[PDB]
């Protein structure tokens, strides 16, 4: 019997492969200073930045913190600490993929806008999250994106909230404009694990 | 001046660490047969586990 001839299906497939994008990566120093005043037990957001796909960051932090003057050399130890978290934008806004041009069905609108927080009456107050992220306090009519504030609540719920004593901080994932920081208070960290603080409500 | 004394905070933290669970893993063969009829162009789910 005869032998079969090949099909062209593989060469046709190869003609349909798009070339890789040529990216033009570069290395540079993105140094920044930040200065603030704060009180013990709060989680203060001292560093905030936006990372692109295909970034690499190496971070060195220098700190000088001064305690306002004690009366006596009080006997108890007191740690300062800094913890860094990555938060993908798709964790804090459900339409982030659709904003970037994803469509659930062909010809869907896309064309979303970044969710907003408006400043409350009197502007954002001192010692709020808006203050600590460096949004100017006391200015009446401004608005800022909600995604940094949602990222703070999401970090809190996943890493700092006690899973059984404390209710989840609200984390709206939709497009809706907020007014004021009533969903975004500055959060307290939990006490160290000891005999009492590692106890549970039930057996 | 004097030198500060330590805090017990690290030993108290260590007493709060739960032990790891002992899992009892094992290896075995989970062979299965499946027989069917189908037509071209459809995505047929032949294996599920």
């Amino acid at each position: 019997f005869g032998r079969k001839v090949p099909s062209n299906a593989k060469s046709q497939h190869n003609f349909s492969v798009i070339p890789s994008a040529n990216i033009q990566r570069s290395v540079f120093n993105r140094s920044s200073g930040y200065k603030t005043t704060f009180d013990a037990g709060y989680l203060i957001p001292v560093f905030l930045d936006e990372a692109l796909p295909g970034d690499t960051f190496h971070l060195k932090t220098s700190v000088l913190a001064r305690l306002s003057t004690p009366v006596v050399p009080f006997m108890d130890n007191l740690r300062l600490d800094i913890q860094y978290f990555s938060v993908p934008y798709r964790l804090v806004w459900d339409n982030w993929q659709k904003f970037n041009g994803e469509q659930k069905n062909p010809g869907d609108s896309t064309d979303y806008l970044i969710p907003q927080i408006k400043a409350p009456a009197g502007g954002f107050p001192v010692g709020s999250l808006a203050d600590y992220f460096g949004v100017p306090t006391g200015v009446e009519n401004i608005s800022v994106s909600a995604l940094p504030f949602r990222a703070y609540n999401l970090i809190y719920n996943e890493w700092y909230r006690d899973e059984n004593l404390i209710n989840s901080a609200p984390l709206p994932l939709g497009d809706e404009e907020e007014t004021g920081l009533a969903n975004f208070p500055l959060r307290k960290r939990a006490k160290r694990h000891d005999y009492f603080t590692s106890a549970l409500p039930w057996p | 001046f004097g030198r500060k004394v330590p805090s017990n905070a690290k030993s108290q933290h260590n007493f709060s660490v739960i032990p790891s669970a002992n899992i009892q893993r094992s290896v075995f063969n989970r062979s299965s047969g499946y027989k069917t009829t189908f037509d071209a162009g459809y995505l047929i789910p032949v294996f599920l586990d």
């Binding site: 913890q83 890493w159 700092y160 006690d162 960290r189 694990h193 | 709060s16 660490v17 739960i18």
Partner: peptide, 10 residues
């Protein structure tokens, strides 16, 4: 830094 009792809180 290990698995704490009561789930994780930093």
């Amino acid at each position: 830094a290990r698995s704490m009792r009561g789930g994780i809180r930093l």
